Design a protein around this ligand. Sequence first.
Ligand SMILES: *[C@@H]1O[C@H](CO)[C@@H](O)[C@H](O)[C@H]1NC(C)=O
Ligand SMILES: *[C@@H]1O[C@H](CO)[C@@H](O)[C@H](O)[C@H]1NC(C)=O
Lengths: 31, 36
Amino acid sequence: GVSVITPGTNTSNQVAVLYQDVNCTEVPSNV
Amino acid sequence: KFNGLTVLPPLLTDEMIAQYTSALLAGTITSGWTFG
Ligand SMILES: *[C@@H]1O[C@H](CO)[C@@H](O)[C@H](O)[C@H]1NC(C)=O
Ligand SMILES: *[C@@H]1O[C@H](CO)[C@@H](O)[C@H](O)[C@H]1NC(C)=O
């Protein structure tokens, strides 16, 4: 699954992304 | 693990919950009912 973490569009438009229980070496800065 | 089925982890780990119970237990051994 893929989840999007946002502070709210009334604060910012930046976003972070969680790839759930996926090893972070096979996803396709801060990893 | 499976087909479209996943298990999400709880927000509090087991370490955090054991920390909470040791804080309750040290509060009661040492202050009685005053800390609540
Ligand atoms: C939402 O926007 C309004 C006006 O743009 C502002 O007054 C309010 O503080 C904002 N809320 C947050 C949580 O930033
Ligand atoms: C992801 O794969 C690498 C390569 O084998 C491994 O070293 C790493 O431990 C894996 N991730 C986790 C969370 O174990």
